[PDB]
């Protein structure tokens, strides 16, 4: 896809809002939404302004102004927006120099793939990440001067086999280290994992599989295909 094809997309489908996404230094996705008329051909080169001093590990208040440059190849509809919203992944431009920002993790990533091509060893590096997670029903944490606490909860949690539940306690709570990978009613996350897998596919992610993981109390994993460095970190 190209800047013009994305602009034609917005005009044809009457998309009113654009959600531009970009990563910060530690690894948290940041975003800013814009009314359709704010995105033109120049947004894909010069970028859109923002405060680079409120993003962790970036600019200092005195040299704050930065630019968001969206990638046309990342455009899809964000399903989590009631209002049909087009979403794009950005890279960060330094407005002072006009060059890509040296602290932008997505710039570093592109530079790494540019370096590989420069050595003559290879032209492509394929990365296949396998990120396990926990699906919790509750989380309570805090720490004051006289306290420190965390309380994680899940219906699958083995620590909950003797508890009174609303109408009532249906058993089948996986045992510790025994979640990989008994069927339902032990596995309570089949429908949700399929939804997680199918919705990210519509976002442009190459999808493969899904399974319940070793841990009791919601450990899960979704399987996605490898891709080129930047594409894989985008995925």
């Amino acid at each position: 896809r190209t800047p013009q094809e994305v602009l034609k997309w917005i005009q044809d489908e009457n998309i009113k809002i654009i959600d531009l996404k970009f990563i910060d230094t530690p690894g948290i996705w940041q975003h800013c939404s814009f009314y359709y008329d704010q995105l033109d051909e120049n947004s894909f080169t010069e970028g859109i302004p923002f405060d680079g001093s409120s993003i962790r590990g970036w600019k200092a208040i005195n040299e704050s102004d930065m630019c968001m440059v969206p990638d046309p190849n990342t455009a899809t509809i964000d399903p989590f927006c009631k209002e049909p919203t087009l979403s794009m992944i950005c890279s960060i431009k330094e407005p002072r120099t006009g060059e890509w920002y040296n602290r932008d993790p997505r710039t570093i990533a592109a530079k790494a793939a540019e370096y590989l091509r420069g050595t003559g060893i290879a032209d492509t590096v394929y990365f296949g990440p396998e990120a396990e997670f926990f699906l919790f029903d509750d989380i309570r944490f805090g720490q004051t001067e006289n306290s420190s606490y965390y309380f994680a909860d899940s219906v699958e949690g083995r620590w909950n086999t003797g508890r009174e539940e609303e109408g009532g306690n249906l058993g089948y709570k996986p045992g510790y280290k025994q979640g990989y990978f008994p069927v339902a009613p032990t596995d309570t996350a089949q429908d949700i994992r399929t939804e997680m897998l199918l919705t990210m596919a519509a976002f442009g992610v190459p999808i493969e599989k899904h399974h319940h993981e070793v841990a009791s109390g919601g450990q899960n994993e979704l399987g996605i295909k490898f891709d080129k460095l930047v594409n894989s970190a985008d995925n």
């Binding site: 086999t161 058993g171 089948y172 045992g175 008994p182 032990t186």
Partner: protein
């Protein structure tokens, strides 16, 4: 021992508390055992004092012989509950292994370290627990002891180690197993006249009908932990 058990229970009740002498009330923590020290004496003199192993006499070694040889049968009287076998489990904390040793608190029979005093020379049978009838448990252990001197049972060689392990004879793993060992080996009790064959038979019958069989019938909560999904 009966007074001991009575005052403890009653002072606990006085202070609004409750006492149990059951071997294993708490899982993954120490059980309640009744280690029983014993020694034979004649004309005021200690007969278990000598120049053999751990400062013991040949008679003392022989008394241990009997105890160790008759230990599985002795357990029908010294450990007479299904719960006894939750404490007498290999590992936590022993004494599952039928051997004598000095200082070793992992052996069935322990010879405590006496301060060079003949009067303090004795064996500690560690297997018993406080669910036993002390009158029956003590009479039984005496009988096995005497038979050991009279036959003249070699206790074997001491085991001075912590924790191949199949080389050493083991105690019964259940109440029925101890009751089986009593049916096979009860002549050291009966032939004496102390216990009647009538009593020995009624003991096995009462324990099977009122404890072994009712227990086999009842589902255990941990069976839900292991088997609810299947």
């Amino acid at each position: 021992l009966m007074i001991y058990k009575y005052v403890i229970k009653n002072v606990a009740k006085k202070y609004g508390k409750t006492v149990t002498f059951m071997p294993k009330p708490i899982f993954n923590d120490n059980g309640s055992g009744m280690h029983v020290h014993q020694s034979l004496w004649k004309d005021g003199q200690p007969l278990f004092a000598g120049d053999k192993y751990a400062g013991f006499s040949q008679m003392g070694l022989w008394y241990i012989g009997g105890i160790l040889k008759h230990a599985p049968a002795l357990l029908a009287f010294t450990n007479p509950t299904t719960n006894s076998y939750k404490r007498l489990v290999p590992g936590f904390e022993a004494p599952v292994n039928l051997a004598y040793s000095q200082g070793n608190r992992s052996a069935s029979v322990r010879i405590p370290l006496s301060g060079g005093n003949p009067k303090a020379k004795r064996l500690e049978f560690r297997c018993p627990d406080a669910t036993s009838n002390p009158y029956l448990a003590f009479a039984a252990m005496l009988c096995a002891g005497i038979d050991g001197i009279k036959n003249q049972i070699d206790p074997g060689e001491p085991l001075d180690v912590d924790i191949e392990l199949a080389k050493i004879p083991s105690t019964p793993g259940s109440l029925e197993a101890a009751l089986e060992a009593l049916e096979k080996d009860h002549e050291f009790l009966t032939g004496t006249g102390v216990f009647s064959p009538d009593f020995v038979e009624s003991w096995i019958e009462y324990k099977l009908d009122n404890e072994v069989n009712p227990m086999r019938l009842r589902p255990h909560p941990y069976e839900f932990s292991l088997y609810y999904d299947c």
